[model samples]
Target: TNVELVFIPSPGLSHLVSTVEAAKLLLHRDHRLSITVLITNLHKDTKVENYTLKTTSNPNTSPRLRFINLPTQEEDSIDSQIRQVREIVSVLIKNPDSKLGGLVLDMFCTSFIQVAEEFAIPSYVFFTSGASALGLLQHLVSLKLEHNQDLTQFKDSDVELSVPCFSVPVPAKVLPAVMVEGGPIEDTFMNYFKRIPETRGIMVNTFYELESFAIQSLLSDAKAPKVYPVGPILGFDQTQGPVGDDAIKKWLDDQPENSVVFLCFGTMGSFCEGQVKEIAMALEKSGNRFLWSLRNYEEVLPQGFLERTKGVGKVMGWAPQAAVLSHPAVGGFVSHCGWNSTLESLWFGVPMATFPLYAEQQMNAFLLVKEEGMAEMITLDYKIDFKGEKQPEIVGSDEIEAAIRRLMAEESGVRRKVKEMQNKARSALLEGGSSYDAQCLFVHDVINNIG
Candidate 1:
């Protein structure tokens, strides 16, 4: 019998990209399996549309794999979205061409599990972040719903939580903003996370060797959903030639090995003029050669700053992050600590100076700097709220400069640790390796569940 899986990803580009890669990995490993990715076009995004077009147009695209774009809707509520998915999935299952084995969901799309239950198909959650973040979410949901704990108290309290994921206790200030600030977002996420255990299993985008403690913590719990660490699921395409600009590539080639610092934040990461000035000062004071990717650089950068540092710096609006990280000239990263960016840095063996912004980035920074000792910290608690209710504290130039120096130091132990992790990450994807084994197990479970 042929096994067909439907993947429903969140609207975010990062989530959609990783989910597609995971589906491809599964299809590559098992010939009996096929995947159809249902893209939610709630928001009209050009980049996502372009990516889908390019992928579908490729000659090497598997005949068994498919991409289907859901109809655009006026209503954006969770219930309404799930209703749309339910209708579409019902029609797909009615077709007698293949047997619907399961529905794979992004963390944000957990509400669709009910639709899966209605159709009598198994559901699995694809967690796009690291294991530690998953552990944090599970633990937080348990505390709030089961223990009847007030999570809002952590906003002003000095308590440190002993989460099962991390080696040491986590300070309350470093938790994700949504957890500390109780509102609709918190309620939505809590509701989503609380239902995670109801699924068959969770597939995290981190390997066991990278986060054994966190993975084991989830696995040890009998009530918790089964955990699968089938990753370092990076989105880089190795078959393609050099990516990004020829000028950038030539500049990197001209520099000595391990001589440049690359600074890039995720798509949404940007700083106010005050913070941007401080960063400029830090880069000038540190005197390190740099390649910085900042949006709206002309409007935010201080006058003459580019001219002053022309010999030592190159600032651009956007960067080919994975390509830059892979270059030999790049040594250290000044990052916003987004999970995809963190994985990319580790995959390239480049150490980081973490300056986390929003979402779960603070926790990611804590895991990298404190728990893993693979990155230096510029700040662990910096947040820029999308609602504009809270103001972010500006980190001074001195702190940023010090962190850059530490990150680029020749004798830094963080560099050694990152190199070791890079090797482990590469090994995990090879035959008989940890990630490969986990992926195979996932396929086996899907097949058995069908029987």
Candidate 2:
């Protein structure tokens, strides 16, 4: 029987891109399976719309894969969004063309699982983050709902908790800001994770070798859903040419091998004027060649900063992250520890200095610096208020410089660990590898569950 999986990803570009990559992987692996990605134009982001057009029009796109654009309303509430999706899926399932195998949900779209239950179809969560973060979310949910514990106590407290995912105790400072803040956002995240166990399985965007301890911890939980570590699912194709501007390409070509430190936070990652100045000073003091991607640099940068570092540094509004990391000139990365960026840096063998900003990035920074020993910490606990209600403490230039030095040192152990992980990441996706085997197992499970 032909099994068609309907994927509902969050409207953000990063989430949509990774979800599509996962869909492409599944379609490539199984001839009996097909995928229909439901695109929600809630945000009306031009980039997301253009990507849908490009991918749909690409001649190489498989016949079995399809993209459906859902009609979005201005209300933008979760209830309205779910109502729209239900209407679309209800119509699709009525057709007799193929069997609706399952509904693959984005981390933010877990509410749609109820619709899957209504139709008696299996639901699977496509977790876009690492296994460690997944474990932390589950642990936090239990802490609040089951144990009746207040998570806000962790805020400003020097307490460390022994989380199952990490071998060592996790410092209270490194927990996600939302959990410590204890507000509506935290409640939303808690609700999302609470329903995760109801799914048939979780397809985490990580490999077992990359997160063995955390994956094992998750699997040992009998109450949790079946776990599938089928990833290193990158959004870009390495075979294609570099993605950013021509000047950036030329500058990278001119730099010495393993000499440039690439600094890029994720798309939403930005800093206040004071923090930007500190970073500028840190780059100047370190005297290392740098390529920084920052918005509004002209206004925020220290006076004559560009002139002083003319040949030593390059600053642009946006950087092609995967391309830069894959370049021979890039020795290290100063990043926000977004899961996608972290995976890309590891895939290209670049050591990192962590500077987490929002979401579960602080937890990811902890995972890399303390748990995996693959990164140096710049400031693992820094968090920007999403509502602009509070200003985060600025990380001083002294701390940033020290981390950069350690990250780009000649005989850095973190560098060695990253290089080792790079090799393991490549091996995990190859034939007969761990992720490859997991993909096969996931396909078998999905097919078996078909009614």
Candidate 3:
């Protein structure tokens, strides 16, 4: 039998992106490793399209890597979500050659853990957010139980949250709704976290040394599983030279030093016509050089929005995120506080204007500015259930302008903090440092336990 690694991602762009990034890194770390990606048909149907201009038929891809797309029963409602997941996971277990060398799962997928248990296969759960935010979500379970807090409580309460790393004050508004579920999902998180020991280990998309206090906190906690940190993981193909399209690269080359602001949001955070227009108009009004990827599915950007902004803003369906953040001309990133984006910003020392949309993003926004000192919290309360997919309320333009102004201001302390964290983040990636050697040992540990 051949050794293998199968990755099952949560059905969302931000989570899948981070998971795939880690899969790419794991392959790079060891050529002998074999990967088989099992993706939700829905997610595959959305992201793996030709729109990204990817080098799909590359000869360099390892022979062992395989792709499996499983159809997801359509129904966006939470009840339907649970049923569809249970059915899919049950089907996956009974598929041909069910034996897997190892299994990796997304944090949001409760059924993955159940399936992993049934198969008697080792599994690992990956979080798409930072450690600081993760701690906050733990509290979300309690808050929901006791306070029965509504969504407004997430952003409005001046509740103090202190992560393991720093004695920082946190407001309630940034907590992910999943953390404070009414029942089943919350119980799943609290219980699934307890079941971590059955897996080979846990891996998050964060470099450990960058979060010293949290790492220590996990180690000190007797119930916490053997957590392995292997990231700052991104989509950069170290082997593939320049990233994204040559057109954006050419435009970036033309821009002056530290003059551009790059804007992107994580999966499920797409703005409506009004929000998108506000951003475009803001860039035009600010007269700052901006490069943005306006995810157009049925076209998210306003009609003629491109022409209205003209040369000041470059909008595309998607951008080579890591490459853009690393560019010298890129001064700030307007991001949704997903872990992958947060780490990339930290890695490149680019200041972040945080607008958390869902999941752990509110937490990501909090950690970046409050604990890591790498960005500005744009303070957009996560009330955006756009299209009624989640929930939505009228958002004021004032909050948006403040986030933009802080990012644009010359004297904003965010720039200095981002640069400082860039060094710390890099130091953690070097050989003998936390992530590098830890990866070496982590792989060895996993492989040795295979028998």
Better of 1 and 3 by lDDT: 1
Off by over 4 Å in 1: 238-242, 296-299, 386-391
lDDT of each structure? 0.87, 0.87, 0.65
Clashing pairs in 1: none
* TM, every model: 0.96, 0.96, 0.77
Q: Measured by TM-score, how close is model 2 to the native structure?
A: 0.96
- Model 1 weakest lDDT span, ten residues long: 236-245
Per-residue lDDT tens digits for candidate 2, residues 1-451, read: 7888899998777888898877777787789988999988833789887888878889877788888887777776877777777888788788787788889998888999988988888999999999998998888888988999998999867899989998989999889887777889778778888889889989999998889999999999888798899889898763364466577779999999889999998887868889999999999999999999886456799988999999998988777899889889999999999999999999899999999998899999999999989999998888865456666688999999999999889888899899999989988888888988888888888889985
Question: Candidate 3: worst 10 consecutive residues by lDDT?
Answer: 49-58
Tens digits of per-residue lDDT, candidate 3, 1-451, equal 3346777776555555566656666665665666666666544554664312242355665555666655666566445544444554555556555335556776655446655566566777666555554455544544555566553344456575543544566655655655544367556666644444446667756777566666666666666556666767765653344365677778999888778999988655667777776676566666778887777422655567677667766777667888888788898888988777777777777788887787667766766677766677666356566544654553445666667778867766778877776776676666766777666676666566667
Candidate structures ordered by lDDT, highest first: 2, 1, 3
What is the lDDT, from 0 to 100, of the residue 436 in candidate 1? 91
lDDT of 1 by residue, 1-451 (tens): 7889999998867788898788878888889888989888723888888888878888877887888877757766777777778888888888787788889888888888999999999999999998999999888888899899888888746789999888899988889878767888789789878888899988999988899899888898987678889998888663352266789998999888888999998988868778988998899999999999988465677778898999888988789998899899999999999998998899889999999998899999999899989999999988765456666579999999999999989878899999999999989988888999999999889878887
